[PDB]
Amino acid sequence: SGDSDFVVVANRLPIDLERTTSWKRSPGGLVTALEPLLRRRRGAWIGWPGIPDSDEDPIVDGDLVLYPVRLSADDVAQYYEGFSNATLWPLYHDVIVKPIYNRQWWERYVEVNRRFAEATSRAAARGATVWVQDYQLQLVPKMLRELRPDLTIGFFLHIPFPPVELFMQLPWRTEITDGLLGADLVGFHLPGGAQNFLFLARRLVGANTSRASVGVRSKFGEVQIGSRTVKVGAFPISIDSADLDRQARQRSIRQRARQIRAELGNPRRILLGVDRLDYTKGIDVRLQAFAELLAEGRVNREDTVFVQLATPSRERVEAYRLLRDDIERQVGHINGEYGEVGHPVVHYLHRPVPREELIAFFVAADVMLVTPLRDGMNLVAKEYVACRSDLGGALVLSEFTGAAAELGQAYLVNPHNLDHVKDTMVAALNQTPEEGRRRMRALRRQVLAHDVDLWARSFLDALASTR
Amino acid sequence: SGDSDFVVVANRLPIDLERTTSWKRSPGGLVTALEPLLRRRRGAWIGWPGIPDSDEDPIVDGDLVLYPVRLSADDVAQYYEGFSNATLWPLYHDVIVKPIYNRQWWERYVEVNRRFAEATSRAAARGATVWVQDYQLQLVPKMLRELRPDLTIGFFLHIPFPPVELFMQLPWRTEITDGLLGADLVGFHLPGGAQNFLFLARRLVGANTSRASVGVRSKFGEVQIGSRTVKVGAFPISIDSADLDRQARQRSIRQRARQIRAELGNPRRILLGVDRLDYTKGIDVRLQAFAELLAEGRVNREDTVFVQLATPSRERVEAYRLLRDDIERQVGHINGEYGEVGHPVVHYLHRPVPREELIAFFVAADVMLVTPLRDGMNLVAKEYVACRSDLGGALVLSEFTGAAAELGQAYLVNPHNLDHVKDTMVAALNQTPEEGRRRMRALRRQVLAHDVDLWARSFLDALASTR
Amino acid sequence: SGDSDFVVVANRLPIDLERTTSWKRSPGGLVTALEPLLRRRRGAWIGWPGIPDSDEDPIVDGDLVLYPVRLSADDVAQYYEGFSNATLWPLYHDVIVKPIYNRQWWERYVEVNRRFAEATSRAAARGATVWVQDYQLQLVPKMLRELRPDLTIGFFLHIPFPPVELFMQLPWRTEITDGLLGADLVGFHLPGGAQNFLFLARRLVGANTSRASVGVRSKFGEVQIGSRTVKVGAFPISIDSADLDRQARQRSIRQRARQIRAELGNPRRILLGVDRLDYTKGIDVRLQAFAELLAEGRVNREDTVFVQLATPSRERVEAYRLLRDDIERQVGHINGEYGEVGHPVVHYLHRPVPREELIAFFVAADVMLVTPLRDGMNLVAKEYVACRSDLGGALVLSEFTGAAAELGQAYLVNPHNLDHVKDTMVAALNQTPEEGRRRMRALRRQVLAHDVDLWARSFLDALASTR
Amino acid sequence: SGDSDFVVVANRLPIDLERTTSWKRSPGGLVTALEPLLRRRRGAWIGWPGIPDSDEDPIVDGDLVLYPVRLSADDVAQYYEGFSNATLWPLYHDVIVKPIYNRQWWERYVEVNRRFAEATSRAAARGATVWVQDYQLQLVPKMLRELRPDLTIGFFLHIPFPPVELFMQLPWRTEITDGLLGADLVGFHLPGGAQNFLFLARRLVGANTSRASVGVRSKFGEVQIGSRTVKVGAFPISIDSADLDRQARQRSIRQRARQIRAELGNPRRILLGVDRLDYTKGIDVRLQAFAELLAEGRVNREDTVFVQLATPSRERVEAYRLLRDDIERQVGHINGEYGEVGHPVVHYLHRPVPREELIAFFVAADVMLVTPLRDGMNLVAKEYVACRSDLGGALVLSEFTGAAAELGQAYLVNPHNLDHVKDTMVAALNQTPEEGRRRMRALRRQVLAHDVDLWARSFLDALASTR
């Protein structure tokens, strides 16, 4: 029973309650991609409203119906801050930080996944399509299948799927793999993730799998699980490109971008970073590179400025606190060394910026610095590109983002190679107008054609074909 | 020119000079495997004598001729402590510790590799066979080929070759890969390493490669490099099994093992660890597991004792210093909590133990704890097995060692799963005599048949076939 | 109202409840000194039973009546772990650790002090004598005077009173001083403490004070506070010397001391440390000194052994956790370097030892190592002396203990001067029998004559004279 | 022999060589006070030119003759960075940081002191007056007296002299005290320092001393040392007040102060800090206080700004590196939380500012924040006062500076009491014009009358009287 023929399930709702109450837009690219999707398409969205011990009364946000899931304080600590973001997040991002393996966290993760599955069953009509999202909910597909074998179940992982050598560290590796194999379709951004999953299915579970490489939105892999076949595919996520492109063309935004440059004392060049404050994002790398370019006199400290817009994220997790301390030290250091009173070389904001203000920064920025150590996709890169209909700008992009597989005309860097990052920043800052416009035209052709609608259609058509 | 038809090249000589002078046996399993080899087989051995600014006068150690390579203090700091053991070692072992990427270290690594290549050329006769060993010398095969295209060149990596996702971090990834591809044969312990290398050769270099899985000592892969073909294979290293087996049978060693038990106050059960003090070895894991078993009263603190024999290693490297501090804290902690005055539960020695004393500990030990987080092979596991001709004992072995692929009848553990480690230690401590003997007989059948002679013959026959 | 003519108030009761319930003897020298006192003398004892949220039902422990004070979990965290032991304790011991100044902790400290005052008033008969103990309760005398101006109130500080330059850091310096000035008599171990308090009363409060030096149990100072005069004195605390001396003579204890030496493999020399695991105690100093003597070959690692008996203390306070980690590291380090399997050079126990076992260790020990960085008195030094009626042994004693002012015939050291500590340990280990006996006879003459009865009589006679 | 009748000896020359060569003004208040002195008065100045392995060729800087002292790299590391600034500096400033006691450092300190003494003897004529400066050179007076008993020798300590309880930690306490007692006159900023020294002379040396309090520039103490009497006094150092006052009146400086306010976007209120980046200076305290006032909305983040001018100091000393990291973190943090792009709330410069630019900042600043945890005097406070002939401004001053004993009309704070610091900053920011001018007039009366000339005359008249 349940009234919805199409249900999305994620740890996040598109809204986030702030503590007296107040709704804000939820952070992260998962919401950035899925929100415009569910605003245009009928369907229900199940998720946590971002505070402990909330109501579970349905919330109507416009045309969209949200079903909130209650998490206790202990749930938030052990399932969300703990297993999800201090076990899985670091492990799947190439153990950039040492994962913590904790059995109590695992037990809570199982409990919460069960709660999400049950909530899904209550929302889902007979024979509904259910699309489960991301690493917090990897047990839900198997749990949901056991409760509701009538459902068609898709799972998409929004973060990298790590190499088998690292995944095998997880004490609950088999349970996680079994969880994912409960879906009819398991999707990843990149073929590499899909292939890691297929190999894992062979070694760990001993299931028969396809042995061919996986294509992009094509040439799907398969895993045989007794009576069932699980389809495996790569579907690189994107943004609502055309909408953002139109938004960035507004006179007010173009005016605001000019004002931002005026407020910065009309620099010749503005470099911009935009990220959650997360250790995967390489904010420390871009600051170090900028610092060394200033030290070497390869960037002019009088007419070049870097703006970093960092959103606070997962702040109770100790690794994130330590990262914040390190980034803020770099900011103070660089300004102390190269700034003047009344004129910093680095402007750093530790807050979410309103959407239209963010777009104005994209339009103002001569160089976009997107330097993650590892990122499943990175939508900030694609957002910048969509905003530059003027064909100005330059995107400096880490090759360890999923986006680099699509945005080859960007200035690609190995963020571990600081000399390469430094050389490339100089190249982007000094590019000719024609070379800049050539690259930006090429990037925009890709991003405008490969949008979130193409992504969702591809995944859901593949999911439907399992019926 | 040069007089030797067969030359081995490694950072280590089999001897190590201590600072007044004194020769000691060199540490590590590379010397453990290669020393008995070169004692029986004609050939020269090029390597560093373990001190800065040594002579380069040839050294005759028995029948064996050694050609020492001089390293300056800066060479030792930047090539050996730096690039080799603070860049490559952590990276190739699944970034257990964060690698440091430093261009000065790279430049020194290149310089030293060049020196080893030149030294090799001087020793090597026209058309000689040269066998280059391990991660410190990955540039030597290409360098040597350019100096001496008449030579047949083999390379063997004694440590894991990491997944492509991690290897690609290395700023000098291409130069390292090109270096290895200078060999006629590149060998790894395991098919997994060989397969990682083949994939890497495809993505990074763009060379045509075989696509099939690689066998054990068979079904070799190939990489096409313009005019040349490079063979790629898996050859799991081992020990001089029969010799060690005979050594362990000596009356004096059996008597010493009984005395060791007496000196420990005749415990019912002795657990033993033997390793270099290296963060890959999981000494912290086995101590934590023992501590928790004592806390839970699952091991009897009155009649069960753990002996850890740790060899100081790479002590100037800060990560190794921090590891030592942590291990020594665990030792003091556990004894403070569960020991009595005059009766520790953990005995910890931070020194190399003489060979016959080590063998006596192997014979005394009811349970061998070999719990690395990652190990290319681990010869300690195989040494224990070779020593237990009495068929007593139990081997607890991490699945993240190369040895686990051969020693399946051991008690295998995921060292990240502390509950699994704890449960398994209890199982080994309480095994029936018949189950213990069954496993030990099976392990010994494997280790006695698959010895260092089989390994070397397999590699060298494959190398010879490239002529 | 209240039934007792004599009431002692301290944060500790002589008993400590362990978490299922169980009574143990309370830690610390305050209980060591006051327990035998109150067992012989009529009177009530008010204090906290060592667990959160206890009953406040009166407890009869032998002839002694105890009135427990309830502390909530927050009280324990903010008043006891917080203000008392992370603000006052480090500050008064020469900021060995950085004090934390926290207003919430202060507010809780005030609240709890009020509760102790009220509890005291309920126990105290009209015109009773009340003796308030130590740094946790410095506000109680003023609070109690305001509730009960009929009472005669004494306060004794069991820890050092710091130099004015450090005391003045305290944001609540004036409130603390006013608190103490509520007493009729304020006592310290040493004239130096009394003199620091007098100076403080002059600068901080602006009260007229005596300007002369303060004597030992004589030549008291005075502070004029409007209508009242507060007497200030030095009264060095001690132990029940004669009782301990008789206890140590028992055949069983002498036999146990011989057995302990046998269990240690009959060493020629035993060094002993006995302390709470507290950063004031210099356990790290004595271990470093021992380590360096072994390294230098000035102590024989085959026949000399160090035993450290450390009682866990204030374990939730982070500074204490960090100290434990450091001490346990030193223990593991020293044994790894100089021990043999089956023969440590350091035996370390992290538990309270039963009294008769402790006495046996005192009797067994050739050298007693009492090396605090700062200690109000240190009763362990005096206990050792009382136990050695055989006149054997040697006391190595830091000059930064209050006991050093009385035990001048001990081997005094500056614990900050590691060479001095090392030289002195060698001197004590190699003393002639006659020199050892001469010193021990002199120390015992002092300790047997200056016992806890002399201390209490001196303080209480001075207090009575204020009536 | 030697040509000068008056010689000053200090670790610093008034000039500092930068590494290619370049002379800069030396840092610190010792040079700020002594430079104008020696520019007006005949005499020689012996000191180190701020680089290792310099010439010792005499340097003529204007009318002033400088005799440089050569220090080797090891001298700089062990005498200057080591004993002086990682042993004495933290110890004498109330062990704000844990002192390191190292015998090699002591031995180097002795050697270097000997070199300074010998250099002094070569410069000093028969019967000359020699004035030795500060904690780096405490052994020189005794050394110089032994070489040259004809000389009249003064010593002045520019940093606090710590309470006896802390000074006694020093393993070389007696040698240091003997060193100072080689002078005819030993001077300190404050009576408290002089009194600590007298007590120390009694306990440690056992010399007869005066027992009375010491006056300001009067009522001197005395220490009897066999045949000699050593005078002890308090002489609070100051600046060349009238000269600085006149300098600050220049039109260009007043214009620059207006421009600085314009460059900051014309804030209503500017707070200013000026210090060496030293852990004694409480830069962390003022930043924390500002941060919390912003969080609490007690300061307007739109029209109030803080400028911190920090001079890099002793940067190779690890404690100073850790301080820099912490301060720079606070700067980045506060701006990230409360700033806007193009508008920081904290401007931080990590460089020495030219004198006339510094004076312009003093004139611009509505509130001067001088919040040391401990400072011998602090001349920045007096400089600010001398600059405000307009009678504007407000000085917020830690009571743990020597200057607080003279500048009582400043807004005094206990920097450990963050609520007090916060309340006081608000009071200073919101003072009435008349109250501000009243305080500033009072402060200026003091500083203009009590200048460096009064200080030097007082010390030198006292020194002359010993002849």
Ligand SMILES: Nc1ncnc2c1ncn2[C@@H]1O[C@H](COP(=O)(O)OP(=O)(O)O)[C@@H](O)[C@H]1O
């Ligand atoms: N400081 C910020 N202010 C406003 N929006 C931000 C900020 N940082 C990130 N975002 C937004 O969050 C989303 C990030 O998505 P993505 O780049 O895929 O990374 P992630 O999902 O890991 O957070 C983007 O839509 C991006 O514009």
Ligand SMILES: Nc1ncnc2c1ncn2[C@@H]1O[C@H](COP(=O)(O)OP(=O)(O)O)[C@@H](O)[C@H]1O
């Ligand atoms: N504490 C020790 N004392 C004596 N020999 C040791 C000690 N620790 C390790 N060894 C020896 O060093 C060699 C280790 O080889 P292996 O297990 O392959 O690891 P690795 O090469 O990484 O050091 C073995 O021959 C082993 O017996």
Ligand SMILES: Nc1ncnc2c1ncn2[C@@H]1O[C@H](COP(=O)(O)OP(=O)(O)O)[C@@H](O)[C@H]1O
């Ligand atoms: N490990 C221990 N086992 C048993 N008693 C101990 C232990 N450590 C200290 N004690 C006892 O605690 C008391 C310590 O008193 P004291 O030396 O004045 O120091 P403190 O009061 O600071 O703890 C002594 O009576 C001493 O014998």
Ligand SMILES: Nc1ncnc2c1ncn2[C@@H]1O[C@H](COP(=O)(O)OP(=O)(O)O)[C@@H](O)[C@H]1O
């Ligand atoms: N950032 C700075 N730029 C220029 N001058 C500075 C700076 N910081 C401190 N000074 C100057 O250094 C001297 C500091 O003297 P003082 O306050 O007594 O402290 P200290 O001697 O401990 O450095 C002042 O003359 C002051 O103006």
Ligand SMILES: O=P(O)(O)OC[C@H]1O[C@H](O)[C@H](O)[C@@H](O)[C@@H]1O
């Ligand atoms: O939801 P947060 O923990 O605040 O992080 C925001 C988002 O970060 C990434 O995009 C994750 O893949 C999402 O699952 C997550 O929602």
Ligand SMILES: O=P(O)(O)OC[C@H]1O[C@H](O)[C@H](O)[C@@H](O)[C@@H]1O
């Ligand atoms: O040579 P060390 O740095 O002392 O380490 C000892 C050995 O450790 C491992 O076995 C390495 O694979 C060897 O290359 C190395 O020789």
Ligand SMILES: O=P(O)(O)OC[C@H]1O[C@H](O)[C@H](O)[C@@H](O)[C@@H]1O
């Ligand atoms: O009571 P604890 O915190 O366990 O410490 C034990 C004792 O240590 C010292 O002796 C203190 O002066 C006492 O007040 C305290 O009771």
Ligand SMILES: O=P(O)(O)OC[C@H]1O[C@H](O)[C@H](O)[C@@H](O)[C@@H]1O
């Ligand atoms: O000389 P620096 O180490 O650079 O420090 C600068 C100055 O700081 C303080 O003023 C000291 O009292 C001086 O002796 C010192 O010269």
